Amino acid sequence: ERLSITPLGPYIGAQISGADRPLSDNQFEQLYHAVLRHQVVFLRDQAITPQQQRALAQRFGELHIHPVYPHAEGVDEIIVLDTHNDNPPDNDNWHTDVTFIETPPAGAILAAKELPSTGGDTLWTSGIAAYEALSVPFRQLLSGLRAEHDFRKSFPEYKYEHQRWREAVAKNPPLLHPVVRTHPVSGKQALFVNEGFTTRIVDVSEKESEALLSFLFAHITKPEFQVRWRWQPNDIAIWDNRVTQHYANADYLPQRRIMHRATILGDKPFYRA
Amino acid sequence: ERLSITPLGPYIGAQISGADRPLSDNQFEQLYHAVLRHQVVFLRDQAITPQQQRALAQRFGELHIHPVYPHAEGVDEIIVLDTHNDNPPDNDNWHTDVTFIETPPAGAILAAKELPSTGGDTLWTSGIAAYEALSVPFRQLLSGLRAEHDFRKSFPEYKYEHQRWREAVAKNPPLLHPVVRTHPVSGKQALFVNEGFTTRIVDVSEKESEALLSFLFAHITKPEFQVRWRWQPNDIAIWDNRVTQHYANADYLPQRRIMHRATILGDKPFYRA
Amino acid sequence: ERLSITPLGPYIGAQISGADRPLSDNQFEQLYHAVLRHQVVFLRDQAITPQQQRALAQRFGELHIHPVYPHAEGVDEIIVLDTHNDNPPDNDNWHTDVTFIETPPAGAILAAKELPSTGGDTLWTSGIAAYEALSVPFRQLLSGLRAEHDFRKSFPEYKYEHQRWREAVAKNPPLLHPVVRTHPVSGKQALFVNEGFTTRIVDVSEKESEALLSFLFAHITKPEFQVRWRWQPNDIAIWDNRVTQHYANADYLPQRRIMHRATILGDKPFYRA
Amino acid sequence: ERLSITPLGPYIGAQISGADRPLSDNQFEQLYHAVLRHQVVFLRDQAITPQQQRALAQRFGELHIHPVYPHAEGVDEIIVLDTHNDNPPDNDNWHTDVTFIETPPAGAILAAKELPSTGGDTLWTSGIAAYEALSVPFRQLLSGLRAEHDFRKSFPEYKYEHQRWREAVAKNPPLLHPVVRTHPVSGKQALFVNEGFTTRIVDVSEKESEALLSFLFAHITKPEFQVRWRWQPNDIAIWDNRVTQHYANADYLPQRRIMHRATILGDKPFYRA
Ligand SMILES: O=C(O)CCC(=O)C(=O)O
Ligand SMILES: O=C(O)CCC(=O)C(=O)O
Ligand SMILES: O=C(O)CCC(=O)C(=O)O
Ligand SMILES: O=C(O)CCC(=O)C(=O)O
Ligand SMILES: [Fe+2]
Ligand SMILES: [Fe+2]
Ligand SMILES: [Fe+2]
Ligand SMILES: [Fe+2]
């Protein structure tokens, strides 16, 4: 059966009505192409279970186990984000999930488990649109440069365990990813740096890299490049983590908020033409 | 009868269900206090007429006639915003409506007349929240300063008529408004500069004013400080223009978009303690 | 006879000992090549007269008459800069002399007439060195762009006469000059924007032009790119105004300071390879 | 005998003619008050020896031994700065000597041992003047704040030994110094942060501290606030390291440059009124 897809804007974003029980190949194909046409998709009234989410995640590709965040009961592929006073939120910043690994995840699945009165809002900005918005000379200047990503930027040492930390650190040293990434599947061009992990553009002077990142970290903020989602229980968010950045509002404390995430591994980011 | 009010976030924003036919004193009182508790309120399925909107506007205070934007049929108090290729949108920037007059409007009413496929989105950021987010030393530093607002910043000469322009210019010279405004009614403290008109903080060095405005124009961007509304026909937006800024996405061309606005005059902005 | 040339640094700057009575062709040739090898040259103990300076200026090319600054007795080609309380200094900013004309001056001659106790210092920064300091990708990005220069930026309306002003304005509208200029004679590459007149790089988005100019206006500040001169009576400064920017300290008021300038016209700035 | 003192500008800077053989109490008193009236003083033709310099240093206060830089023959109080290709220069940045210790040095003595063709230039900017240049509201805002200084900022780990490094690190953890310091002796007010070590103003939001430091690190750059010295063999530089910042040009490689420094300990920086 056809899926009900309502696009949330001219660029990134959309909402659907399917039936998450496993998906009938034919639907998962519509969904996939959906999570591809719009970088993010939202589904409401889907009270799934950890074991159930991981199943859906696999339908896209192998999963990833976060080296820091805690996992669900007996499902290490499904990250549990339980925030409150004894564990404040640390996703109130523009970042692209796990880019400190050679092959950053090409997608993830968020399940709205337990929510606060209001707030907790999460936004997604499109790298593709952001890129199309760059003047030609800038597209040239950026296409080809490489930027360093450091897991320690969004997971500093002082906030940590300090033995379990050092472990994840040495196992995830800083690496390089193209400033302008080409989509494995769509082949569309998109900006690929995120305030969350990008430390500096390695192919320009320190002051130059500094200047360009200030611009870019801001540039991706433009409201036209994004979508905002007001959480509701048992909501489901699926997005293409290879051409987007997202922010999660930290405005619900002291209340509690519980979210489950399925991290999906992708290939190696690369640029083309 | 009580009104259905659903708050869109911990700070700014909310949605209601009333009956806009004129309001029963008792309701207008709930609405007023609503447009006061949350800086913005949204109502859907309200196919009013220009004459009808202006009526509702008056219920708050005297109106204002914009010296540039065109008016409705036989209602000069209701501004008509018809955008398209022959008249591109010029509200894709953080601004507070008409602050280039000694007594900037304390409110406005937007009617979603004719909409495009998607986009056109409009966001509102809260000056009150933005202010509470400033460290103490900054609150001190800002509370008391004055900033110049110039109608020519958001309505440059080159985009113009050039005789009707010069007229509105000379009749609306640059003036000063406190950087930190106190709410006439709530008495709450709030930042009161907007990238749209604020040219420089007159009480600090040029480089200092420059530095502070960069920070502030950015500071008000923080997602936690705002609400985003996805337009739908016959939607109604009412907001307190004395403690907020708003942005209207320019991502619907070549399509057309029609909006009616009721501008409501307020008193003279002032700071206190 | 050979001239005594002492270079003030690895890049821009140097000091000489000649005899300014007119120059013997052979010397003027050494001087020219001097004012070419180092972008600026300084000569002390040269008590020349206006008529005498203009003579020396001509030896390089036709002169220029500034449309605003006042001229000497009966020599309109020699600008007189008499600063004090009733006429504060307006050259305390990085600028390249007269770039708001299609063919900005390729040189100028400054005569230290009457000096204050100390201060009044003047610095010169090298566009050539500044350019060599740009990473390759930046050199590419910049080489080719065009920037608008507006005489009104460094000579605003409010500081003015307002009839003599409007005259110079209409006769010197904003125009374009390459962001990266190639030297008519040396053929060396150099940055060619100056905080003094450059308003925006016309070939990139407003936010992009804004970002790049912030970087550049700062970049040219790097101490390695400059020379500083501590004025002394009857001192003479000659510099290549087509590959440099200069700043004149405003730290001598209420005292008085008198300087004579010979402005020399150059060809049309252009880029190459 | 009276000393010949020629001030290099209205603020910071000056040149003298004494006789450095030990100083006759009476002269050292003139010199001291000199290195106090102008923040920096320069003496030429003074071919002293390490043992000889340290002697002069002591005349001011106890010395300091740098935990990283190498020392002279048998004089650990006199730092030897020998730069070249196998040891590039690392002082091409605005910094105030050793502020990563609770009681940063109140002075230092530089001896121009062996110089390159040209370049190597060193500049000093005055914190006192820079402070007087801040608008009142800014002086208030800044006076009282505290900023963190981290020895690791100007001596990163990656550039290192890594055992001798960790040693100096643990023995010199980040600490706090007032953003606005009051002079122990003169009692004058002065800005006290330096791009070299200041990491963030601890008493404001991260984005606020970030904004203020950008302004300040730039503010101290203003040419009016400084003095520039063109090195010559056997030159001597003495400056008040508690109200100044200095920069040393890195533009002489591959050539070699040798400098000796006497670091003098001062009291604990504090603010007053
Ligand atoms: O809590 C949220 O809504 C999102 C957290 C986040 O950034 C993530 O799960 O990657
Ligand atoms: O078109 C819109 O939605 C809003 C335009 C706007 O800023 C205004 O009407 O003040
Ligand atoms: O007064 C000075 O030393 C220089 C003024 C200046 O910029 C000029 O004459 O172009
Ligand atoms: O090499 C120089 O002239 C100065 C080096 C420096 O900053 C210092 O010795 O503190
Ligand atoms: Fe995330
Ligand atoms: Fe508006
Ligand atoms: Fe000039
Ligand atoms: Fe130093």
**C69 and C154 in contact (C-beta within 8 Å)?**
no
D147 at interface of C, judged by CB pairs closer than 8 A = no
- Residue labelled with tokens 């001798």: D164
Q: Is D260 annotated as a binding residue?
A: no
Contact A215 C211 (CB under 8 A): yes
Contact B230 A8 (CB under 8 A): yes
Marked catalytic residue, from B20, B64, B97, B242: B97
- Check if A122 has its Cβ closer than 6 Å to any atom of ligand 1: yes
Report phi then psi at C228, rounded to 5. Answer: -125, 135
Pick from A121, A219, A252 the residue to mutate for testing the B interface (most B CBs within 10 Å). Answer: A121
Q: What is the dihedral angle through the alpha carbons of C200, C206, C207, C213, rounded to the nearest 10 degrees? A: -10
Question: What element of type H or E holds D211?
Answer: helix D206-219
Q: Is C166 helix (H, G, I), strand (E, B) or coil?
A: helix
C238 to each of A194, B207, C44, C111, how far by Cα in Å? 48, 31, 12, 9
Residue-wise over C205-233: b if at least 16 C-beta within 10 A, else e?
beebbebbbebbbebbbbbbbbbbbbbee
**D98 and D263 in contact (C-beta within 8 Å)?**
yes
- Check if A39 has its Cβ closer than 6 Å to any atom of ligand 1: no
Please list the helix, strand and coil fractions of chain C in percent, rounded to the nearest 5, in that order: 25, 30, 45
* Reported resolution, Å: 3.0
B84 to each of B76, B95, B117, B164, how far by Cα in Å? 22, 21, 13, 23
Order the strands of the A198-201 sheet from edge to edge. A175-178, A146-149, A198-201
Q: What is the DSSP string of chain B?
A: ---EEEESSSSS-EEEE-------HHHHHHHHHHHHHSSEEEE-S----HHHHHHHHHTTS-B---SSSPEETTEEEEEEEEEBTTB-----S-B-S--SSSS--SEEEEEEEE--SS---EEEEEHHHHHHTS-HHHHHHHTT-EEEE-TTTSS-GGG--HHHHHHHHHTS--EEEESEEE-TTT--EEE---TTTEEEETTS-HHHHHHHHHHHHHHTT-GGGEEEE---TT-EEEE-TTSEEEEE----TTS-EEEEEEEE-----B---
- d(CA A83, CA A253) in angstroms, rounded, equals 8
Q: What is the DSSP string of A24-67?
A: -HHHHHHHHHHHHHSSEEEE-S----HHHHHHHHHTTS-B---S
- d(CA B71, CA B51) in angstroms, rounded, equals 12
**A178 and A100 in contact (C-beta within 8 Å)?**
no
CA of A64 to the centre of ligand 5 (A): 13
- Check if A259 has its Cβ closer than 6 Å to any atom of ligand 1: yes
Q: Which atom of ligand 4 is nearest to the CA of D81?
A: 1
Question: What element of type H or E holds C16?
Answer: strand C14-17
**C259 and C248 in contact (C-beta within 8 Å)?**
no
Q: Is A130 helix (H, G, I), strand (E, B) or coil?
A: helix
- d(CA B179, CA B202) in angstroms, rounded, equals 10
Q: How many Cβ atoms are within 10 Å of A64's Cβ, its own excluded?
A: 21
Per the structure block, which two tokens stand in for B94?
Answer: 């953080």
- d(CA A76, CA C17) in angstroms, rounded, equals 80
DSSP letter, residue C139: H
Ligand 1 binding pocket mutation candidate from A81, A93, A228 (most atoms within 8 A of CB): A81
- CATH architecture of the domain D1-273 equals 4-Layer Sandwich (3.60)
Q: Is C246 annotated as a binding residue?
A: yes
Per the structure block, which two tokens stand in for D85?
Answer: 């290709």
Contact D203 B138 (CB under 8 A): no
Q: Is A167 helix (H, G, I), strand (E, B) or coil?
A: helix
- Check if A91 has its Cβ closer than 6 Å to any atom of ligand 1: yes
CA of C249 to the centre of ligand 8 (A): 25
C92 to each of B93, B207, C119, C220, D24, how far by Cα in Å? 33, 14, 12, 15, 43
**C42 and C34 in contact (C-beta within 8 Å)?**
no
Question: What element of type H or E holds C247?
Answer: strand C244-248
Pick from C92, C118, C221 the residue to mutate for testing the D interface (most D CBs within 10 Å). Answer: C118
Cα C217 from chain centre: 15
Q: Greatest CA span in chain C, whole angstroms?
A: 55
Which of D:179-218 have CB within 8 Å of B? 203-205, 207-208, 211-212, 214-215, 218
Per the structure block, which two tokens stand in for C45?
Answer: 């103990």
Contact A205 C141 (CB under 8 A): no
Q: Which atom of ligand 3 is nearest to the CA of C108?
A: 10
- Check if D97 has its Cβ closer than 6 Å to any atom of ligand 4: yes
Per the structure block, which two tokens stand in for A159?
Answer: 């906030």
Told to judge if B54 belongs to the known catalytic residues of this protein, a careful annotator would answer no
- d(CA A233, CA A120) in angstroms, rounded, equals 12
**C154 and C244 in contact (C-beta within 8 Å)?**
no
Q: Is D223 helix (H, G, I), strand (E, B) or coil?
A: helix
Q: What is the DSSP string of B108-176?
A: EEEEEEE--SS---EEEEEHHHHHHTS-HHHHHHHTT-EEEE-TTTSS-GGG--HHHHHHHHHTS--EE
C68 at interface of A, judged by CB pairs closer than 8 A = no
Please list the helix, strand and coil fractions of chain A in percent, rounded to the nearest 5, in that order: 25, 30, 45
Ligand 3 binding pocket mutation candidate from C92, C115, C246, C258 (most atoms within 8 A of CB): C246
Of B135, B203, B211, which has the smallest distance from its Cβ to D204's Cβ?
Answer: B135
Q: Is C122 helix (H, G, I), strand (E, B) or coil?
A: strand
Told to judge if A33 belongs to the known catalytic residues of this protein, a careful annotator would answer no
**D226 and C226 in contact (C-beta within 8 Å)?**
no
Query: What method was applied to determine this entry?
Result: X-ray
Length of chain D equals 273
Determine how β-strand A107-114 pairs with β-strand A257-264: antiparallel
Marked catalytic residue, from B38, B95, B181, B183: B95
**B129 and B245 in contact (C-beta within 8 Å)?**
no
Q: What is the dihedral angle through the alpha carbons of D266, D267, D268, D272, rounded to the nearest 10 degrees? A: -110
B245 CB contacts (<8 Å, ≥6 apart)? B94, B95, B96, B124, B125, B127, B194, B195, B196, B220
Please give the interface size between A and B, counted as residue pairs whose CB atoms are below 8 Å apart.
Answer: 51
CA of C110 to the centre of ligand 7 (A): 10
Q: Is C214 helix (H, G, I), strand (E, B) or coil?
A: helix
Q: Which residues pair with residue D262 across a beta bridge?
A: D78, D109
Told to judge if A246 belongs to the known catalytic residues of this protein, a careful annotator would answer yes
Q: Which stretches does DSSP call E strand in C51-197? A: 71-72, 75-83, 107-114, 122-126, 146-149, 175-178, 180-182, 189-191
**Exposed, middle or buried: residue A55 (CB in 10 Å: 0-12, 13-18, 19+)?**
middle
Q: Which residues pair with residue D270 across a beta bridge?
A: D182
- State which residue of chain D sits closest to C249, comparing Cα positions: D224
Side-chain half-sphere exposure of C99, counting CA atoms within 13 A = 30
- C95 contact residues in D (CB cutoff 8 A): none
C230 at interface of D, judged by CB pairs closer than 8 A = yes
C contact chains, 3+ CB pairs < 8 A: A, D
Q: How many Cβ atoms are within 10 Å of B27's Cβ, its own excluded?
A: 17
**D265 and D61 in contact (C-beta within 8 Å)?**
yes
- d(CA C179, CA C216) in angstroms, rounded, equals 10
- D141 contact residues in B (CB cutoff 8 A): 137-138, 140-141
**A41 and A31 in contact (C-beta within 8 Å)?**
yes
B contact chains, 3+ CB pairs < 8 A: A, D
- d(CA B224, CA A247) in angstroms, rounded, equals 10
**Exposed, middle or buried: residue A89 (CB in 10 Å: 0-12, 13-18, 19+)?**
middle
* Nearest-5° Cα angle at D113, D107 to D118: 100
Q: Which atom of ligand 4 is nearest to the CA of D112?
A: 3
CA of B117 to the centre of ligand 3 (A): 59
- d(CA A143, CA A267) in angstroms, rounded, equals 19
**A269 and A183 in contact (C-beta within 8 Å)?**
no
Residue type, C194: N
Per the structure block, which two tokens stand in for D130?
Answer: 């820079």
CA of C91 to the centre of ligand 7 (A): 6
Contact D140 B140 (CB under 8 A): yes
Q: How many Cβ atoms are within 10 Å of B205's Cβ, its own excluded?
A: 16
